[PDB]
Amino acid sequence: AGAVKFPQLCKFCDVRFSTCDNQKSCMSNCSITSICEKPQEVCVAVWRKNDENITLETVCHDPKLPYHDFILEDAASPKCIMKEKKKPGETFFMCSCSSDECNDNIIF
């Protein structure tokens, strides 16, 4: 039978300036917990730091669709474990997780 796939709860503040710096664990400090628009969507957390300051991104996103020109492996994982991405002059980190508010606790 066609059981309804129900979307998850994720932090959804998008691009926000963050104080998360040189830490093993970070809280999102995103007040917006959203029911994702689409059933297959999962939680995403993007950590970016340049020469100036730091930015943190929180979104619902489709697993098999590129975000920042990157794939989403380990999206079935219940915790958001960050992994480094190669960008020139740009410190890049991203995690994907399939649990309610899992992108609130960002683990390095």
Partner: protein, 79 residues
């Protein structure tokens, strides 16, 4: 308009017509199974995007397991 199996709908040939979803719930405590099939209206689904009434046993409290569905006559169980 959806068409769901309704065990209570004796005059309606065990079917209900709704604009929402079909529902099932199963109670299991020491050799017993309580089957409950009905229609839920879209106003009674809170919210429409993810109704709390449809939250399974892993979310609600592990007393009974709930099943929600959008297919026709889907809310009946037979092994």
């Amino acid at each position: 308009a959806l068409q769901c199996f309704c065990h209570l709908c004796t005059k309606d040939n065990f079917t209900c017509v709704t604009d929402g979803l079909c529902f099932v719930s199963v109670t299991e405590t020491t050799d017993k199974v309580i089957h409950n099939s009905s229609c839920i209206a879209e106003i009674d689904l809170i919210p429409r995007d993810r109704p709390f009434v449809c939250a399974p046993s892993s979310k609600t409290g592990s007393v009974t397991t709930t099943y929600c569905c959008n297919q026709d006559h889907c809310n009946k169980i037979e092994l």
